[PDB]
């Protein structure tokens, strides 16, 4: 399974972790068997002005199951009022860029 | 407050919605001990100290 995250989030790619990546993007099972390999790619995945082609999920109704892949872009309801697909107060776009 | 003289706020007799805090994008650390961060709204406490 290959993907890009920022340095501080590398620790989240492990069993028993929590956080925006562990919970909403890429979840590993507590009984995971395997190896997590990472390297700095600042010379590839960064650009002047900011590289906005790498996204992560910031909001979700619930945590992901192990190896679940959620790629929806539906507006997240933070409040008690239905968003009806329109972002605004208490209605968030679920993804964000690393830049 | 300074860490050597930290400030304790006693919280009681109220409704505690912890999803507002947990689902926030504005915090870099949110680590719960002795309790799941997603079960907090199902629990009742005799007091909360912030």
């Amino acid at each position, epitope marked *: 399974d290959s993907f890009v995250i920022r340095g501080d989030e590398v620790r989240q790619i492990a069993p028993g972790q929590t956080g925006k990546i562990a919970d909403y993007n890429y979840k590993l099972p507590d009984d995971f068997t395997g190896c997590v390999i990472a390297w700095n790619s600042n010379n590839l995945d960064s650009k002047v002005g900011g590289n906005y082609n790498y996204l992560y999920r*910031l909001f979700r109704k619930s945590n992901l199951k192990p190896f679940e892949r959620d790629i929806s872009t539906e507006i997240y309801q933070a409040g008690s009022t239905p968003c009806n697909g329109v972002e605004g107060f208490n209605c968030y776009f679920p993804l964000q860029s690393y830049g | 407050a300074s860490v050597y003289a930290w400030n304790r706020k006693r919280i009681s007799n109220c409704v505690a919605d912890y999803s507002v805090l947990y689902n926030s994008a504005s915090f870099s650390t949110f680590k719960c001990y002795g309790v799941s961060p997603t079960k907090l709204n199902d629990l009742c406490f005799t007091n909360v100290y912030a």
Partner: antibody
Framework: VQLVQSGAEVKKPGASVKVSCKASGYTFTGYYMHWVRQAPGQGLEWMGWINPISSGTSYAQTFQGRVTMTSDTSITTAYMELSRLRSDDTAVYYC??????????????????WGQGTLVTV | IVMMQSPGTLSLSPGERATLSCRASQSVSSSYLAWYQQKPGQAPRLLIYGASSRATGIPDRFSGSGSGTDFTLTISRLEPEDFAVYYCQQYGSSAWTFGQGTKV
């Protein structure tokens, strides 16, 4: 944090104008880009905003139906296109940065950075 | 909503204190009230947000306070660069509203 807008424009009534705003010094998609108008001798009027991550927008009822906001994250630039220009649209147009609605400390309630005003004459 | 500032014009000597007022037609959360400074020929800059919090780069000569429908901006000592137009700004109902502005 810098916001750099295009130069002044002169348009005839019925024409459309597109004002750009290039952002730098921050994560472009981490903030909403707002546009604020200031007619000569008048105060500041909020027009609307765009959220570059999705290009979702919201407009003031005053401009809704006439103004379209777009953005391009690859060049961290926001655009505001105001159609059907009238003589009373003569104003200095500013781009301004504010936090997204999910900001815990309500950074969306105000504009912390502004670009240089761009004068549009109609 | 209507945000009404007063006085329309404020005139006093450098080195003295000035108080600028902004009244709301309805209650405004302190978290949603901001003050801006606009020098002639320049874009507005943020001075105060959240009713009382200074923006980064703003001198401690500037302070704000208030709640409900009555907010103020205070300049403890006026410098030549403080003789500009000030605005109050409110957020609510998914909209941003500015006052008419006052000139110092």
């Amino acid at each position: 944090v810098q916001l750099v807008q295009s130069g002044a424009e002169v348009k005839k009534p019925g024409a459309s104008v597109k004002v750009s705003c290039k952002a730098s010094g921050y994560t472009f998609t981490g903030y909403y880009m707002h546009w604020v108008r200031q007619a000569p001798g008048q105060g500041l009027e909020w027009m609307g905003w765009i959220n570059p991550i999705s290009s979702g927008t919201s407009y003031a009822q005053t401009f809704q139906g006439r103004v379209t906001m777009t953005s391009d994250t690859s060049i961290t630039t926001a655009y505001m296109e105001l159609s059907r220009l009238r003589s009373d649209d003569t104003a200095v147009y500013y781009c301004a940065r504010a936090a997204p609605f999910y900001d815990f400390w309500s950074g969306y309630s105000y504009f912390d950075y502004w670009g240089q005003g761009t004068l549009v004459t109609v | 909503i209507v945000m009404m500032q007063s006085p329309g014009t404020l005139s006093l000597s450098p080195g003295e204190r000035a108080t600028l007022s902004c009244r709301a037609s309805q209650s405004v959360s302190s978290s949603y009230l901001a003050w801006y400074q606009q020098k002639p020929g320049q874009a507005p800059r943020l001075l105060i947000y959240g009713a009382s919090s200074r923006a980064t780069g703003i001198p401690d000569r500037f302070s704000g306070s208030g709640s409900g429908t009555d907010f103020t901006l205070t300049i403890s000592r006026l410098e030549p660069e403080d003789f500009a137009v000030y605005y109050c700004q409110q957020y609510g109902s998914s909209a941003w509203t500015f006052g008419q502005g006052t000139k110092v």
